[PDB]
Amino acid sequence: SMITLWGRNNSTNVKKVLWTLEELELPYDQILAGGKFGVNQDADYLAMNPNGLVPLLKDDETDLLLWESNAIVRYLAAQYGQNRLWVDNPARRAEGEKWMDWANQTLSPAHRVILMGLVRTRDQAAIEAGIEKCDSLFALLDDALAHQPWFSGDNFGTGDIAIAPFVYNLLNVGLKWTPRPNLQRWYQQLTERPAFRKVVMIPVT
Amino acid sequence: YFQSMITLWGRNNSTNVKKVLWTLEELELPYDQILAGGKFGVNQDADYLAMNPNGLVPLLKDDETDLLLWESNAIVRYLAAQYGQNRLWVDNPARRAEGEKWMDWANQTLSPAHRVILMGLVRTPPEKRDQAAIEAGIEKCDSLFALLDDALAHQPWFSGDNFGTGDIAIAPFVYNLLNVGLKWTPRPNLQRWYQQLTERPAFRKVVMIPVT
Ligand SMILES: N[C@@H](CCC(=O)N[C@@H](CS)C(=O)NCC(=O)O)C(=O)O
Numbered sequence: 001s002m003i004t005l006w007g008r009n010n011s012t013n014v015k016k017v018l019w020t021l022e023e024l025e026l027p028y029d030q031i032l033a034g035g036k037f038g039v040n041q042d043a044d045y046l047a048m049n050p051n052g053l054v055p056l057l058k059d060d061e062t063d064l065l066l067w068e069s070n071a072i073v074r075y076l077a078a079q080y081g082q083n084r085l086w087v088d089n090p091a092r093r094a095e096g097e098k099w100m101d102w103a104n105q106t107l108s109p110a111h112r113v114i115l116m117g118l119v120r121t122r123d124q125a126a127i128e129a130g131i132e133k134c135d136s137l138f139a140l141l142d143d144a145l146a147h148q149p150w151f152s153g154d155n156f157g158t159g160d161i162a163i164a165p166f167v168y169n170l171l172n173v174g175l176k177w178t179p180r181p182n183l184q185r186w187y188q189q190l191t192e193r194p195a196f197r198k199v200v201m202i203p204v205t
Numbered sequence: 206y207f208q209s210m211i212t213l214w215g216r217n218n219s220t221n222v223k224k225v226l227w228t229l230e231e232l233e234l235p236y237d238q239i240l241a242g243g244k245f246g247v248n249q250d251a252d253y254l255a256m257n258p259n260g261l262v263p264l265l266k267d268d269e270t271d272l273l274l275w276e277s278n279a280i281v282r283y284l285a286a287q288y289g290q291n292r293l294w295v296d297n298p299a300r301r302a303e304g305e306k307w308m309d310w311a312n313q314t315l316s317p318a319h320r321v322i323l324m325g326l327v328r329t330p331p332e333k334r335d336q337a338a339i340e341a342g343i344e345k346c347d348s349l350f351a352l353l354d355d356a357l358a359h360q361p362w363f364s365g366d367n368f369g370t371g372d373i374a375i376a377p378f379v380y381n382l383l384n385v386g387l388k389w390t391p392r393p394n395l396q397r398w399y400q401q402l403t404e405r406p407a408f409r410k411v412v413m414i415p416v417t
């Protein structure tokens with residue numbers, strides 16, 4: 001295929017890209033990379049991504065080699081998702097896109113505490129503190145969804161793609177949270193999307 | 206009554222606010238600033254939290270487009286696409302992405318390392334400094350500078366052929382790090398780029414102010 005994706009399936013950031021590719025019905029070749037798969041710390045990979053992280057996406061059609069999951073999602077949307085996942089109007093686009101930055105700058109670090117502490121390990125305090133932080137972030141997201149159906153606004157979009165893989169993990173590590181009805185309604189609509197069920201709804205490991 | 210269509214909330218010594226001030230100045234857009242953050246308050250008021258539940262700055266209102274927007278990088282990309290076509294916005298998705306990745310990286314990778322140093326040397330007195338943490342922050346930032354130096358080996362700007370929003374995202378952090386009394390391993394491509402920035406009137410106006 002013209003598109004190559006490096007990354008493992010149990011990565012939030014890789015999931016964003018796999019999910020976008022599936023939503024847009026784009027063909028791609030996956031190369032397992034990260035963790036016990038290696039590849040991502042090889043000299044040849046570091047020449048493509050000096051951070052040595054996944055995902056990495058190559059698009060031979062546009063001579064593109066791109067890292068940063070959110071940039072990859074926005075690229076795929078603009079290039080292949082016109083009138084589907086790309087919002088043309090800058091202001092309406094921004095209202096959704098802010099949630100991409102927020103997903104990685106605010107939600108991800110709180111999520112990391114839980115995924116590390118519970119799944120891939122423990123420090124009662126640490127974790128309990130991360131749970132409180134995530135519960136508070138869930139309150140914020142619940143309010144954000146009080147008057148619109150999607151983080152991207154009127155329609156499902158790239159803000160929703162950025163946030164949901166983290167939320168998926170947090171709702172599947174045996175924890176029970178304060179009920180958040182707007183957030184839960186939103187999550188249910190994601191579970192109805194075949195691409196989400198395929199890519200995101202897999203075991204937490 | 207001398208009021209503008211764009212309102213910006215935030216204090217001048219914030220990296221994230223600087224990105225937006227700098228963009229507004231590059232595009233020669235009129236704006237009204239409302240000081241907010243730190244000792245200025247405003248950002249934890251109920252009225253402000255209703256606009257930005259994170260209670261952080263910057264926040265930008267654009268009355269022309271009925272927009273109320275937080276996240277500095279999203280604000281910069283908005284201004285570029287709306288007001289900076291053929292100046293700061295790169296139309297081609299792939300060529301745009303090559304620059305825009307550096308916006309994500311600035312805030313996800315550079316910012317946390319910068320934060321250690323800014324908090325430690327600028328906003329903590331010597332008697333309370335964690336010298337170990339600062340030294341580790343310095344090591345980390347020196348390694349990130351090596352990465353940025355290599356990235357600039359074969360192109361003039363993070364945004365590619367021309368100055369752009371990837372450059373805007375990275376530079377305010379680099380400015381602080383170069384103005385806190387530290388000497389770094391030389392990085393010739395990074396230094397050449399930084400000098401380029403110092404020749405831009407909007408950068409001199411907004412970014413090149415005292416580190417406090
Ligand atoms: N800012 C990057 C973060 C990427 C990242 O942290 N990737 C992780 C997986 S979630 C990784 O490569 N970890 C090292 C490994 O798996 O070997 C992005 O959003 O794409």
Ligand SMILES: N[C@@H](CCC(=O)N[C@@H](CS)C(=O)NCC(=O)O)C(=O)O
Pocket residue numbers: 105219220221222241242243248260261262263275276277278312
């Ligand atoms: N992710 C946000 C982060 C904003 C942020 O951290 N703002 C800081 C200033 S750099 C702030 O508001 N601190 C609280 C304060 O100044 O009271 C963005 O990029 O705009």
